[PDB]
Design an enzyme around this catalytic site. Structure first.
Site, PDB file in Angstrom:
ATOM      1  N   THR A   1      -3.123  -6.758  -5.614  1.00 48.71           N
ATOM      2  CA  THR A   1      -2.553  -6.939  -6.954  1.00 48.71           C
ATOM      3  C   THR A   1      -1.322  -6.056  -7.230  1.00 48.71           C
ATOM      4  OG1 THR A   1      -4.805  -7.412  -7.758  1.00 48.71           O
ATOM      5  CG2 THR A   1      -3.112  -7.021  -9.442  1.00 48.71           C
TER       6      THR A   1
ATOM      7  N   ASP B   1      10.022  -0.601 -14.863  1.00 50.11           N
ATOM      8  CA  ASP B   1       8.924   0.171 -14.281  1.00 50.11           C
ATOM      9  C   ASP B   1       9.287   0.561 -12.839  1.00 50.11           C
ATOM     10  OD1 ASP B   1       5.502  -0.072 -13.471  1.00 50.11           O
ATOM     11  OD2 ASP B   1       6.181   0.866 -15.327  1.00 50.11           O
TER      12      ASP B   1
END
Lengths: 258, 258
Positions: free
Chosen positions: A14, A125
């Site tokens: 993920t 990010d």
């Protein structure tokens, strides 16, 4: 876009949405498949963003080969990176890391960030967790996409939220002031993550405590593996006055002659 | 704590913290190992919530076995569920169901939800994507890790990032007022997911239009595989006035009555 049928072996894990698997596209390209959920994302929502991200090409950015612009978990197909994420790499068992290669990593990331900078594309990010390493040891930035652009001077987007904090400018830690200089701050923390060999920034601090300290003047110490000059570089990224911070272009030059 | 006496296998369920992996634990317990990540969240933090979750137990709740918060990457091992998430289950080969199997699934979930309610533990993200199915076809609710055992009946949060709007009552849509009745609403939508055989709620709407649609007092249409009776129970979950929405015990008693 992406012809839904291609080779597939195992999975990976993920990143920002759901599960990323592995397969072979076009019988020559190795890929990782990013899965969503037919109950959130859609072929009509990301069509815009997809085309825009495909506008991003650079040997240091993990490339989006294509997306299954249809409805069900969106099978997005990206560049398979044999060595996984940088964070796990830095902590690698046999810590055979010389400053020479440590800097190369910062260079690979800086080049990618430099072209994003030029292309007026914010990452939002930026951290070692969002960087991947391939079979060659090359570090490429990924996890960009919903990563913002720019306009007149700023924006707002999702009001109220939980940012990574450590990789964030004091501006964003309070009123979420995201700008070209926000990625600069995070890049310095990333460099710190590199020379720290995976050390989590501001360890021994809580999120609320880390947030208060950065504003007052708290900064990241020089990692044992970094030289005085390398620390100067990463530290230029942390000026609370965004304007006093260097560009990825300058950051790239300084890195080239250390 | 849990000494890593596990092996390794393949892909598995996901959650807002990440995906999980396969392994065997202490002899023959099939587990799915979830990562919390590296450093980010510290051992001390999760300890409390870990104790809190392990105190929860119902055969219709995916059980947490232990925490491997051993400094480096914090791992969590939950019970392995062979068929994956209910969402995938509802659309895949098993698609050929029957009302009997559809109601059974609602019951399994209502059993786990009624139990949480009695323990003042709320699940802030109930959706079909969050339910898993074992090899016996049993449906269990999961991903209630971050969920809060709220001492006070009215709940307030931090909020941000994004919202699973399609399963949220207006008071959550307006100022994150989660409560027991927020789960009830989300459960009612889950029922609609079960009965429409895995379809996404309001697919032609957008997260913003969905909020407007609900603001008009409109809900999710009766799916062709639901009786006027089955539709009456799920429809009650979406009352608007929180206190007019049934309890999980009542919903379960309704479900049973047939």
């Amino acid at each position: 876009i992406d012809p839904k049928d291609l080779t597939f072996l195992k999975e990976l894990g993920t990143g920002q949405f759901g599960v990323v698997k592995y397969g072979k596209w076009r019988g020559q390209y190795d890929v990782a498949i990013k899965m969503i959920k037919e109950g959130s994302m859609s072929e009509d929502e990301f069509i815009e963003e997809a085309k825009v991200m495909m506008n991003l090409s650079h040997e240091k950015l993990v490339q989006l080969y294509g997306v299954c612009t249809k409805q069900r978990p969106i099978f997005i197909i990206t560049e398979y990176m044999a060595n996984g994420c940088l964070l796990n790499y830095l902590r690698e068992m046999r810590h055979r890391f010389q400053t020479q290669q440590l800097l190369e990593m910062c260079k690979d990331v800086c080049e990618a960030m430099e072209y994003l900078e030029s292309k007026q594309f914010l990452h939002r990010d930026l951290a070692a967790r969002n960087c991947l390493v391939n079979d060659q040891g090359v570090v490429k930035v990924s996890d960009f996409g919903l990563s913002r652009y720019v306009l007149d001077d700023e924006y707002t987007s999702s009001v109220g939220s939980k940012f990574p904090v450590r990789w964030s400018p004091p501006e964003v830690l309070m009123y979420s002031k995201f700008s070209s200089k926000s990625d600069i701050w995070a890049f310095g923390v990333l460099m710190w993550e590199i020379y720290s060999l995976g050390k989590m920034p501001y360890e021994r601090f809580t999120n609320s405590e880390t947030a208060e300290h950065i504003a007052q003047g708290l900064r990241l110490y020089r990692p044992h593996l970094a030289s005085e000059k390398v620390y100067t570089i990463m530290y230029s990224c942390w000026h609370e006055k965004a304007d006093e911070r260097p560009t990825f272009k300058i950051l790239l030059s300084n890195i080239l002659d250390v």
